[PDB]
Amino acid sequence: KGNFNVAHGLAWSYYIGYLRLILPELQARIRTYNQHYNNLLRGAVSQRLYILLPLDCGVPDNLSMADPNIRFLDKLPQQTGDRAGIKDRVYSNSIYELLENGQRAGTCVLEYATPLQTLFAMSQYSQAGFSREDRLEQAKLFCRTLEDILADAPESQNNCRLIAYQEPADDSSFSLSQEVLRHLRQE
Amino acid sequence: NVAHGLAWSYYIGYLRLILPELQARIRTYNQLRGAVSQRLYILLPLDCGVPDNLSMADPNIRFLDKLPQQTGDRAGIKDRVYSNSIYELLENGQRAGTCVLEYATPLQTLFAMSQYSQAGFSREDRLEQAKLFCRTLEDILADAPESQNNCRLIAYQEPADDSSFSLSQEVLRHLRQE
Ligand SMILES: Nc1nc2c(ncn2[C@@H]2O[C@@H]3COP(=O)(O)O[C@H]4[C@@H](O)[C@H](n5ccc6c(N)ncnc65)O[C@@H]4COP(=O)(O)O[C@@H]2[C@@H]3O)c(=O)[nH]1
Numbered sequence: 001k002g003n004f005n006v007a008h009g010l011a012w013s014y015y016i017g018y019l020r021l022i023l024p025e026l027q028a029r030i031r032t033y034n035q036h037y038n039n040l041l042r043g044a045v046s047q048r049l050y051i052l053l054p055l056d057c058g059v060p061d062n063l064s065m066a067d068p069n070i071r072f073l074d075k076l077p078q079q080t081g082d083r084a085g086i087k088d089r090v091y092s093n094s095i096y097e098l099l100e101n102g103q104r105a106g107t108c109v110l111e112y113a114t115p116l117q118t119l120f121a122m123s124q125y126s127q128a129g130f131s132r133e134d135r136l137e138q139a140k141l142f143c144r145t146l147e148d149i150l151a152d153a154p155e156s157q158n159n160c161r162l163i164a165y166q167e168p169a170d171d172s173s174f175s176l177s178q179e180v181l182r183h184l185r186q187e
Numbered sequence: 188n189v190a191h192g193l194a195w196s197y198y199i200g201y202l203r204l205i206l207p208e209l210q211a212r213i214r215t216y217n218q219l220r221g222a223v224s225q226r227l228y229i230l231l232p233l234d235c236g237v238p239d240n241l242s243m244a245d246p247n248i249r250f251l252d253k254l255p256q257q258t259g260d261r262a263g264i265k266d267r268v269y270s271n272s273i274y275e276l277l278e279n280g281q282r283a284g285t286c287v288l289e290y291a292t293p294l295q296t297l298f299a300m301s302q303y304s305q306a307g308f309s310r311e312d313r314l315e316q317a318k319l320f321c322r323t324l325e326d327i328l329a330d331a332p333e334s335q336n337n338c339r340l341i342a343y344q345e346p347a348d349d350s351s352f353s354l355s356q357e358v359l360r361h362l363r364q365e
Contacts, residue, residue: 002188009189010196012306016299017292052263063263072265085230085241085289087250090268112262118196127327128195152305 007141057120069099069177190316194323231342235298247355
């Protein structure tokens with residue numbers, strides 16, 4: 001229940017401070033990108049933000065380094081907002097091409113859920129104290145709470161997909177692009 | 188335990204990343220008008236009332252300029268951008284100081300949290316977690332290698348309907364003591 005409270009808090013933080021701010025205008029930015037910059041008839045950027053939730057909270061900062069079949073392609077147009085005294089705080093998202101048998105098999109806006117980096121740290125540093133098994137518990141509850149939030153959130157309208165999975169980023173037999181592609185091909 | 192996550196979040200996902208590069212962005216900014224102070228000033232209003240425009244809290248806090256942007260690859264975002272704002276502090280219509288200044292955004296998150304039924308967070312929960320957030324953040328930075336006299340936290344209560352309080356005067360008091 002204390003792993004509940006931490007995870008509950010980070011999921012609400014993630015919604016209040018990011019998803020609720022960017023999901024309203026996401027499809028507009030994607031549409032702008034597809035109309036004017038990407039006229040590949042089978043290579044349109046898909047309409048949803050894909051959010052990676054590795055349940056071990058192992059979050060590399062470079063997505064491309066994690067898999068050879070993920071290639072960094074471009075950025076969406078930036079989104080700016082005055083926030084808590086910061087003028088023109090920048091919200092940015094990255095577009096990736098997903099490769100399969102040397103072909104561009106998918107194109108999407110893709111990123112990790114950055115709160116998982118905090119769950120990982122607090123299982124690393126004594127002053128936070130959490131167990132690795134706390135971490136794993138908190139990650140599941142984070143995903144579950146986030147799922148709950150998005151289900152009822154007006155800003156989420158077929159424009160966000162959570163991709164939760166157990167495999168480390170270290171793992172010999174796991175393809176991150178294949179994980180993303182399987183979900184993409186379901187829409 | 189909500190405030191503990193948010194405090195570690197603010198350190199792990201922000202303060203530890205920007206504080207090591209702060210002294211150099213300020214030096215790059217210093218190209219006559221006044222030297223900026225060496226420290227990031229972080230406002231921690233315990234009522235979690237966090238306006239997006241600082242002049243809305245005090246018209247004597249006026250925006251002056253931005254630092255040069257910091258970029259970093261983060262959680263799959265290429266060149267995530269970290270920006271900060273330089274403000275002047277007026278006293279009798281005239282500039283008395285300038286500093287990099289912002290609110291701790293997790294406190295805005297606690298406030299909005301407490302406004303949403305599904306978060307299950309009372310106004311009383313909110314103040315208690317505001318305090319815990321400040322105490323946690325402080326205990327973290329006391330030990331953090333990246334905090335090297337490059338950050339100043341200002342936590343404060345001001346009751347409802349009380350304008351005896353000048354945020355600009357209070358920041359000026361801290362700048363003058365340092
Ligand atoms: N003042 C200031 N504060 C920042 C900044 N950067 C992070 N902070 C805060 O420091 C702590 C760890 O931030 P972190 O990134 O780990 O978590 C975030 C993140 O996942 C997501 N978010 C938000 C913006 C965003 C983005 N542009 N791109 C991708 N994700 C994004 O929403 C969470 C809560 O955002 P919030 O804003 O309320 O507080 C966070 C959080 O308390 C910053 O530049 N300026």
